[PDB]
Design a protein around this nucleic acid. Sequence first.
DNA 1: CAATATCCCGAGTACATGCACAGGATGTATATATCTGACACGTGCCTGGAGACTAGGGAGTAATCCCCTTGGCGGTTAAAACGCGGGGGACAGCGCGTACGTGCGTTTAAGCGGTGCTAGAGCTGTCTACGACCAATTGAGCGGCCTCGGCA
Length: 48
Amino acid sequence: VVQDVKYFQRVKWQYMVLDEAQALKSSSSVRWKILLQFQCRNRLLLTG
DNA sequence: CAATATCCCGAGTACATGCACAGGATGTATATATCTGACACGTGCCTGGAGACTAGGGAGTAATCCCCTTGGCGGTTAAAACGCGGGGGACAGCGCGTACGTGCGTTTAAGCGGTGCTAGAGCTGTCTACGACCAATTGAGCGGCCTCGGCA
C-alpha cells in the first residue's frame, strides 16, 4: 500500500481497516505520511 | 578611399597533331557441321487462395524533464606575413633486363572400361535442445534502536 498508492487513489474505498495499527506509531514514517491521504468514511484501528 | 589582387588581351612561342605513306596480318568468304537447345510435349507442386480464431502488438494517450538547445562564457591558437635554407630541378652515361627467338619435351584432353562414392532415400530412431517451471542471490529502501552539538 506504501508503493501501489497510484492504484489505491483510483477508487473511493468506503472504509479502511488498519489491522495491528501499532505499525503506524511514528509520524516521521512514510507509511504514516502516505496513509493519511486516502479518502473514506471511517478509519478503524484494531491494535491491541 | 587605397591597396593587393584577379581578370583580360595581344606577341611571341615548340611541338602535337593530324595527316600521308608502306605494308602486313587478319577479317572476310564459302563450304561444311553437328549439335545446342528450341520447341514442343506433358508432370505434379506450390504458389496461391480463402476461414476462423486468439493474443500480441499496435496505437493511442498522459504526464513530464531529459536532453537538447541557446547564450554567453573565457582561453588559446591556425592564420598572416615575413624573413630565411636548403633542396627539388635540369644534364652526361652503363649495363642490366626485358624482350624475343629457338628449340626446348611436360602434360592434358580424349576416348577407353570398369566400379564404388555419394547422395537421396527412412519414420530411420530417438533425445539435444526447447520450453516450463522452480529456486538463490544480491541490492536497495524503510523501519527501528542508539551519542552528541547547538540552544534555554
